[PDB]
Structures are given as structure tokens and as C-alpha cells.
């Protein structure tokens, strides 16, 4: 920034401050899916999901 425009800065800055306070005032009072994971793997822990038979000589 430069000094030739100084006032302007302050003003907007000051305005900003005010704005903040309004926000600070706004906030001063302003205005399921169960199943789980281990229990879902344990709820689906019923079999019919594997296959193995080998060993030859």
C-alpha cells in the first residue's frame, strides 16, 4: 500500500472491524444407519462362502 491512499485503508479496515462485531453479535444468540462393521461381519458370519479340497500323493 501507499500513503496517498491511507485514509481509505483505515476506513475500510474500521468498517471491517464493525462488520466483525456484527458477526460477533449475530453469534451472540443467532437463529440411524446401524449395522456397524464388526457386528455386520458377525451378522453375515453365516457360512456358504468357502471351498477347499486337495492334497495329491
Amino acid at each position: 500500500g501507499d500513503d496517498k491512499k491511507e485514509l481509505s485503508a483505515e476506513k475500510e479496515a474500521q468498517a471491517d472491524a464493525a462488520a466483525e462485531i456484527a458477526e460477533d453479535a449475530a453469534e451472540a444468540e443467532d437463529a440411524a444407519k446401524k449395522v456397524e462393521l464388526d457386528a455386520e461381519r458377525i451378522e453375515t458370519a453365516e457360512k456358504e462362502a468357502y471351498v477347499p479340497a486337495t492334497k495329491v500323493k
Binding site: 440411524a32 444407519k33 446401524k34 449395522v35 456397524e36 462393521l37 464388526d38 455386520e40
Partner: protein
């Protein structure tokens, strides 16, 4: 990375269950606390998960803190093939 799909499943499942992972910045660590894999497998699989916008990664003090994201709940839902409204630490505990 290049890892058998079993360890990848250990990872993705575990993350899906906890929603939160941690891992120290030290590869060559043989085995990770809890998860049944190489530490590096976890760190890198996680890096993959985040760099496609499914999880979030943080550091500080030589430790990786991994958060799971909602889109990541979609993709991990697909990858674990479980039905919609499935799991994750998104149920307010017992009563605590």
C-alpha cells in the same frame, strides 16, 4: 503400490471400521501397531487413498494422522461391497 490384495483388504477394512488411522514416519518397521501388515504398506496405501480424495492426511511430529472422508465412505463402501448405510465410527458409541 505393489502389495498382495490381502494386506490391502486388512487396510481398507480396518480404516472403514475405525474411520481414523495413525502411522509413524518410519518405514522398515516390519509390522504396524494393530494392523497385520508392513508399516510401509499402510502408509503408502493410505497415500493412495488420500491422493484420490477419499481420505485426508496430516503429519506433525513424525506421525501420520489419517481421517476418512464421506466420498471415501462411498468408495470404501464399494470396495467392501457392503450395503448402503453400513458402518464407520458414525454411530455415537453406546451412550458415551
Amino acid at each position: 503400490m505393489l502389495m498382495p490384495k490381502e494386506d490391502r483388504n486388512k487396510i481398507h477394512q480396518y480404516l472403514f471400521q475405525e474411520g481414523v488411522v495413525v502411522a509413524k514416519k518410519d518405514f522398515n518397521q516390519a509390522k504396524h501397531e494393530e494392523i497385520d501388515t508392513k508399516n510401509l504398506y499402510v502408509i503408502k496405501a493410505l497415500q493412495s487413498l488420500t491422493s484420490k480424495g477419499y481420505v485426508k492426511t496430516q503429519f506433525s511430529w513424525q506421525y501420520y494422522y489419517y481421517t476418512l472422508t464421506e466420498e471415501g465412505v462411498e468408495y470404501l463402501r464399494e470396495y467392501l461391497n457392503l450395503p448402503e448405510h453400513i458402518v464407520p465410527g458414525t454411530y455415537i458409541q453406546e451412550r458415551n
